[PDB]
Design a protein around this ligand. Structure first.
Ligand SMILES: OC[C@H]1O[C@H](OC[C@H]2O[C@@H](O)[C@@H](O)[C@@H](O[C@H]3O[C@H](CO)[C@@H](O)[C@H](O)[C@@H]3O)[C@@H]2O)[C@@H](O)[C@@H](O)[C@@H]1O
Ligand SMILES: OC[C@H]1O[C@H](OC[C@H]2O[C@@H](O)[C@@H](O)[C@@H](O[C@H]3O[C@H](CO)[C@@H](O)[C@H](O)[C@@H]3O)[C@@H]2O)[C@@H](O)[C@@H](O)[C@@H]1O
Ligand SMILES: OC[C@H]1O[C@H](OC[C@H]2O[C@@H](O)[C@@H](O)[C@@H](O[C@H]3O[C@H](CO)[C@@H](O)[C@H](O)[C@@H]3O)[C@@H]2O)[C@@H](O)[C@@H](O)[C@@H]1O
Lengths: 140, 134, 140, 136, 139, 140, 137
């Protein structure tokens, strides 16, 4: 591929998902989480030049954040909080862009990945009630 | 034109105001929402208003002809019964404003030259999206 | 005009005033205010190459601040505090210059304008006992 | 060839004018009265100390200014009105030197900046009124 | 063509060397415990190689992963340890040339501030714990 | 003189001292001070190209600091704390160099002098049991 | 010499030592019990010998490895003054934002000369009695 694949972190649960577009970058990402369970429950992605919302997980959470990404905007800093192991869950995400935009979703109470940086082109993982595992995908 | 996600509820009357030289946010401590927004444009003296100026606070941001939004955050209640609660804007000249409350959900929007606003208002600002120039 | 007019903020009361010189900018501005009423009461302005003092409002306040402005010195940051509505008043002013000078007069308890920036050339509003309304005027 | 910052404070005291640039300036103030009482000034190529006011205060600060050194930041605290007094001074220089004398409880002037060339005002027992004077 | 940072901690554990002919680290995982306050397990991935190299026993209740871009160097590196023959490696702080930083474990006894540069591999000794850890850099 | 003399600050007491070497600058300066009396007691000075330690005052203080100065290193900030008057004393010294080296000695509880900056070439004042008075001397 | 010698700070005790050949590694051993340095090890560029002095009796150590092009921009040694003096701590900061901190700073301080750390010199037996840094020009 012409892509970089960040480690999927979290557990083995959920239905798999992959969100990529043939020559497309993420223009919008949404994280839904709960104070009650301290996990991510639901993720939405929009891509450049495509009106479709791609969604996974159950939007059961009392909070959401959206990050909109300009066409020339990169991720210069990215951290995913998670519970490790087979019954693991994805708990939080901090993103920071080349234009000083940042977002913070969920909780960071067990494990952390500091991912590869670049132009966010997609996400892969598994989800059901919760976001079980999550990995970012970048352009090279 | 770049259209930023309209955030908040499906309630109130649609509006579309379409570069911005002045924007005013009216909010209340009682309901912790935006109620009223005014906009003035370059080379036009008409004031475009929406929602009800019920709130006990207002802020005005005046934008220079060559000034851009380098930072923009809208707080809101998600759901069909959603509301805009708050706006934070930061400009290319270190100017910044802060209206309302940021107690539930947040969007960090596209940046650029603020060229208009779309959404729905009645008693309150139900939904708000920014619009930028390319 | 070769002038930018910032929104006049506060109420409709008081006698209109406009302080502007045919080809001059403000070299000195003084704000009078009170802890008792938590409003601006009085403003004085001197201009480059003019020894007249232009005054408006009643100097009844227990506090004053003077900002002296060098000829090549601009405002880069400007905020006016006020009470909105017909019975509105101007409550405070924060100015910051291109040479790191700043001043702070009065109170910021209700409403705010972040104004246009530039070379402060004049002011315009209404005053009697109090500063009813205030708007800044800049060069282009 | 001089810029005159507003003289701030009262109408009281014997007038003074110190001009000849300032190489040294000393402020004397009291915690009892919360005012400046006394100021001394030395100038470049001149060993005379020019004083005004009564050095009754329990604190002093001296700022020595290098020959190429400017004031980039200057604030004088005062009581406004005819019975007015100069209550405090903050100076910051082009070399990151700063000083703080006295109190800032009532009124403030943020003065013009530049090469500090002299001072002017009135003083008897207290510093009644103080204006800075700058080169162009 | 390689710079060897001091191996810190004890003499115990099976030796290990993770390095690939003309290949730098792209991912490194540190597993540690609040119970024993040590590193227990390290995993490493290399550029153009899908094999995971692991050592120690993954019994810790915490992990951190640092992914390294191909042009990304280490500008700050601190390893926490207990000195002596019975020694252990207790913690790792890394900072990269792109403002990425990670923090694993505890810094309660001894500290090395290592050489900097392009992290090429790791060497030391591990069994149920990481006994000893040294970094390996390109020039 | 090809020297600049900073005001000597503190009292008229002790024995006069003047530490200068024709065509040599300070390479080391030691300050000794007391928590008990909150004053400087004793200073030493070494010069470039001279092994003689010049000392003054009584080294009775429980603390000392040494600043070594590289041949090309200037003082870019200098503050001396002191007690004003005939019975005055020198209580404290902060120095900062052109290479970001700083030292801090003693207490700053009464009066302050922010001195001239430049190449520290010598010191002057008076001392017996304590440092009564201290002035810095700079090159041009 | 083509070297700058920092003031040796501490007491007159100990066997004298001088380690010169630039430093690629320096290790400080110190105790919470006595709150002094006890032991220093140095390795040099292109030399496998470990040069050691004092007694490694302390419960803490710190190692600073120094890249070939890396200098000391900040340097503070903590000590007890007088003839029965000791060296109590070291703070070094490098041109690459690296810093280490060993032992205690409860009495006296030297802010030393800076530059490329080329060696050390002092006296030690049970403790580090005195410590001076050596720099290139
Ligand atoms: O004959 C005395 C006169 O006294 C009062 O009116 C005059 C002033 O009253 C003040 O309290 C105030 O209302 C002033 O109003 C001016 O200033 C206010 C505040 O800025 C402004 O809003 C107004 O527009 C005016 O500029 C009045 O001047 C009354 O008691 C009156 O009845 C009486 O005749
Ligand atoms: O009767 C007036 C005044 O009398 C007493 O003060 C008198 C003198 O006091 C001196 O200490 C000094 O204040 C003199 O005034 C000079 O100094 C002040 C301060 O700068 C200045 O305002 C004056 O202009 C003079 O230069 C006074 O004359 C006191 O009883 C006082 O309370 C009383 O009002
Ligand atoms: O027996 C001699 C002397 O003993 C006592 O004074 C000793 C010292 O006491 C110090 O506190 C101080 O007073 C000293 O004064 C000298 O040093 C100070 C500090 O620098 C200085 O200001 C003075 O100018 C002196 O040089 C004393 O030396 C007393 O019992 C005394 O009465 C007796 O002479």
């Amino acid at each position: 591929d012409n892509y970089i694949y960040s480690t999927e972190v979290g557990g083995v649960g959920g239905t798999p998902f992959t969100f990529m577009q043939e020559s497309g970058t993420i223009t919008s990402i949404k994280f839904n989480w709960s104070d009650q369970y301290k996990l991510l429950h639901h993720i939405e992605v929009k891509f450049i030049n495509n009106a479709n919302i791609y969604a996974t997980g159950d939007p059961k959470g009392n909070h959401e954040v959206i990050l909109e990404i300009d066409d020339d905007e990169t991720i210069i800093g990215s951290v995913i909080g998670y519970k490790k192991g087979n019954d693991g869950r994805c708990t939080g995400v901090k993103l920071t862009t080349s234009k000083g935009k940042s977002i913070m979703a969920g909780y960071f109470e067990e494990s952390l990945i500091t991912t590869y940086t670049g132009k966010l082109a997609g996400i892969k993982g598994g989800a059901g009630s919760d976001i079980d595992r999550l990995g970012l995908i970048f352009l090279k």
